[PDB]
Every structure is written in C-alpha cells, then in structure tokens.
C-alpha cells in the first residue's frame, strides 16, 4: 500500500496543442492492412509492443490479459485453415495469417487462479483488455508496422492450439508485420468530430 | 469503393527496436491519477484527443462510439453526486476538479434516416480499442486521466441525453495532475506473466 509522487512530463497549454494535433495526424495515417510482407522482424520489437500494451490501465490492476505471440509457421497454418473453414461457412481467403511474421492472439482473463486453487474474479475485463489492444495497435503504428485487427476466429481452435487455460478466452486476433509492396487499403472516410463528439458547455 | 496504396513509413529492424523501446518506456510512465488540477485546458486540445481516439479500427468501419465531453461544472457536480451515491452502497472530488469529463458511449446499432436499425459489429472491443487510443492521446498531450466505471449508467444516459442505441462505456476525467499528486506504488507484470511466445 505504498505511494509515490507522479512523475509526468507536462507542458504549457501551447505545447499541448501541437502535441495533440501532431499526434492526431500521426494516428490518422494508421490504416488496417490486409496484405503483409513476410519480411522478418526482431522478436524484441513485438515484445516491446506487447509490453507497451500491458502498461494499459486495468480493473483493480489485475491486468487480466495474456498476449500469445505466434511466429511458428506450422501453428499459423493450423490457425489460418481453421479461420478460413469457419468463415467459409455461411473473403474467407486469409493468407495474411500465415504470411504475417507474427500473430498476436489476445486473451482475456475472467478470473485469476491462485496456487490454493481459489478464483479471484477480475473486474471490467472486456474494457481493460480492449484498452490494452488500443495500446497494442498504437505501439504497432509507432514501430512503423501495420496490423489487421481480426475477430478471434475460431475461438475454440485458438483456445486449444494455444493451450490456454479455462479462465482465458480469445479476445482479438492481430497479425503484425511490414506491409506488402503493392499493399492497398480501401478509400474509407472517418467520421468528422460533429458525428462523434458531443459537448456540454458552461 | 476506391482503393489507395498504403502510405506509411518503414524503418529498418534496428530503428524499429529503438522506437518500440522508446515508446514502451514513454508509455510505462503513464499512471492513473486521481488528484487533478483545475487548470483550464483549451477545448481544442481535447478535440484532437477525441478525434485521435476516433481513428481507432472498428467492426465494419461503423465507428460505434460517441464521446461526450463535459466541462459544465453543474453537470460535473451532478455526475459526481450520483457516482458517490452508487459507490456508497458497500468520495470522488476528481469528477468536479478535472476541467473535463470524457464520457465514452458505445452504439449497439446505427439508426438510419428511414428509422431502420442497422446492427453494429464487435462494439465492446471496438470502443475499448478507441478508449485505448484516447488514453494514449491523453498521455501524449502530457495530460493525465482516471479511467473510471460509467456508473450509474442510467443517470449518465439521462443527464447527457443520449439515445437508446447508445450506452455509457467509460467515464474519464481529464486534466493536469495535482501539485502533490501521489500515485500508488504499483508494479506491472513482467514479460513472463503476460506474454507467451511460440517459437519454431
Ligand atoms: C474488433 C474488430 C474486429 C475486426 N475484425 C475484422 C475481421 O474479422 N476481418 C477484417 O478484414 N477486418 C476486421 N477488422 C478491421 C476493420 O474492418 C477495420 O478496422 C475498419 O474497416 C476500418 O479500417 P481502418 O482501421 O483502417 O481505419 C476488425 C476491427 C475491429 C476493431
Ligand atoms: C475498465 C477500467 C475501469 C476502471 N475503473 C476504475 C474505477 O471505477 N475507480 C478507480 O479508482 N479506478 C478505476 N480504474 C483505474 C485502475 O484502477 C488503474 O488503472 C489500476 O489501479 C492500475 O493503475 P495504472 O493504470 O496507473 O497502471 C479503471 C481502469 C479500467 C481499465
């Protein structure tokens, strides 16, 4: 139950504007990419990126998440086929799950498990893990990499093949890597502030 | 349905190591602050922060979120009261002190002009991610925040006058930190406790 003074670099309202403005333009350049280069990336980059995600706030500091980093070609092949076969039942074509150097499979912990077997339930897990995934993608973009935020599909396969315990569930599938040379993204337009931001003034 | 070549910077692995490490340590310095300063912040600062959050990915590009920014000391004080009464069942000065409350709402669905309801996809995680970008933007701006439960939901829904398709997702005061701002001496999990790596 110790305490420490907050060590945070703050800036005058002037420097806060350029910071917030420049950062918005930087993040606005981020786009979901679905065509990856199989170019190699040092694991330490991914480790830092995952670690950067783990710095996110969490309900009661539980940090109820497990980041399963996957570079093994055989596992990625298994996961791909499972994803294609599940989406095939209703593109379903998903070569990016094998071609991307790393699959970051995010799991959410509904509860922690202690040595004595008892279960200490976590709080606001969906929110906490979601925020961490936000930090993940923000870090991926900071590294100069691209990603494909993807549904954790199929959940049961991902659960087994990664051998994660029953307290955990797949939250998000995130292939990561360089973009392909001929990579293209859809000409999408993001909502303007009038459509997303309501303001109650004095 | 047009298409654009991806326009993004590429670094060598080493320049990636640097930036990935440089960004981790910067983000490690972020802490939940519960003691705020009443120092006024330009509305435009938080406008950028909210739009930064809005650049987040979303299921089917629906962007199912509404960021309700509250500076009105009167509504901030009413939100404070109801929050305390709710948490009383078993204390929140920051909800008034912080110059802004960013109440994030999630949209279960969109309502078309013809009154039809077009359902959204993976709203919880989409908005959660967006809230991640929000806190990243806040930290980038040298500001601090208190990620907080959206309680009570019915009250926040009513007083902020949001439609049925929306529900409170998170409440976050935003502002400068207090002078003698103390944070709990917490220690984050290490690589071993949160990261499982499958090599070849
Ligand atoms: C929770 C979530 C799940 C997603 N699942 C998929 C998916 O299964 N397949 C896919 O191609 N894209 C998926 N996406 C990516 C979105 O379609 C994409 O972010 C959206 O089209 C907007 O594009 P942008 O992120 O580049 O701005 C997902 C995004 C989110 C946030
Ligand atoms: C989804 C979510 C809900 C939270 N709700 C509260 C809350 O209701 N009250 C509070 O004091 N802190 C709340 N927090 C903040 C956490 O308690 C805090 O982030 C945690 O103690 C770890 O501290 P850190 O974020 O500085 O690393 C919440 C955080 C998250 C992610």
């Amino acid at each position: 139950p110790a305490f420490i003074p907050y060590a945070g670099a703050q800036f005058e309202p002037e420097e806060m504007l350029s910071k917030s403005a420049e950062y918005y333009q930087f993040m606005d350049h981020r786009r979901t990419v679905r065509e990856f280069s199989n170019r190699a990336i040092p694991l330490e980059v991914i480790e830092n990126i995952v670690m950067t995600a783990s710095t996110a706030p969490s309900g009661a500091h539980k940090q109820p998440w497990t980041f399963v980093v996957v570079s093994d070609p055989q596992i990625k092949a298994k996961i791909r086929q499972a994803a294609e076969k599940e989406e095939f039942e209703s593109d379903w074509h998903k070569p990016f799950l094998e071609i991307a150097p790393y699959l970051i499979v995010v799991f959410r912990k509904a509860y922690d498990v202690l040595p004595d077997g008892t279960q200490r339930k976590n709080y606001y897990v969906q929110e906490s893990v979601g925020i961490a995934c936000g930090f993940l993608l923000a870090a991926i973009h900071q590294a100069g990499l691209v990603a494909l935020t993807h549904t954790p599909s199929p959940m049961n396969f991902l659960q087994k093949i990664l051998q994660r315990p029953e307290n955990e569930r797949p939250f998000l599938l995130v292939p990561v890597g360089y973009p392909a040379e001929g990579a293209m993204v859809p000409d999408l337009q993001r909502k303007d502030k009038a459509a997303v931001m309501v303001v109650y003034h004095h």
Side-chain angles (χ1 to χ4, degrees), chain A:
Chain A
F3 279 89
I4 286 173
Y6 178 64
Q10 71 176 38
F11 331 97
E12 294 292 284
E14 187 187 13
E15 181 171 1
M16 283 180 46
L17 265 170
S18 60
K19 283 256 186 298
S20 68
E22 287 180 354
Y23 188 63
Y24 167 59
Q25 296 298 342
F26 172 68
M27 292 299 280
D28 193 42
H29 274 129
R30 183 209 66 74
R31 292 298 310 276
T32 290
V33 175
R34 301 188 172 77
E35 297 135 38
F36 294 85
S37 170
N38 78 326
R39 176 176 182 186
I41 297 166
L43 176 57
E44 281 229 319
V45 179
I46 312 308
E47 286 187 332
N48 296 347
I49 286 169
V50 170
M51 278 298 101
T52 304
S54 200
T55 63
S58 54
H61 192 44
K62 287 293 200 175
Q63 295 176 277
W65 51 65
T66 304
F67 288 93
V68 186
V69 178
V70 182
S71 68
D72 188 75
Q74 287 203 343
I75 298 172
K76 291 194 293 187
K78 288 206 192 83
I79 287 173
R80 173 181 170 188
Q81 296 162 354
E84 298 186 338
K85 287 162 189 174
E86 197 249 286
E87 180 153 322
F88 187 32
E89 291 154 3
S90 55
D91 320 330
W92 52 259
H93 177 54
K94 298 170 182 175
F96 52 74
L97 292 177
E98 281 196 71
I99 289 173
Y102 295 96
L103 302 190
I104 305 174
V105 190
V106 187
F107 281 73
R108 75 179 183 254
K109 290 165 127 206
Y111 56 87
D112 282 348
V113 187
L114 287 130
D116 54 312
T118 57
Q119 310 176 351
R120 286 187 177 165
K121 291 195 173 180
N122 301 308
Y123 311 95
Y124 291 90
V125 178
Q126 276 197 355
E127 295 78 10
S128 303
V129 177
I131 289 168
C133 290
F135 282 17
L136 187 75
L137 291 160
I140 290 168
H141 190 48
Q142 274 285 345
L145 290 170
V146 298
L148 169 48
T149 307
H150 198 110
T151 64
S153 293
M155 276 189 71
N156 273 325
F157 193 100
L158 293 177
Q159 189 89 47
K160 275 203 189 180
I161 194 167
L162 304 181
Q163 314 148 354
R164 303 311 311 168
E166 55 179 14
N167 68 320
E168 293 183 4
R169 287 291 178 286
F171 186 78
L172 265 171
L173 183 61
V174 183
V176 170
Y178 285 95
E181 294 175 357
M184 306 200 75
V185 297
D187 181 18
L188 297 174
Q189 305 304 329
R190 300 193 168 115
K191 293 175 183 179
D192 75 318
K193 63 171 63 183
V196 298
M197 183 171 161
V198 180
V199 183
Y200 280 84
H201 304 104
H202 189 320

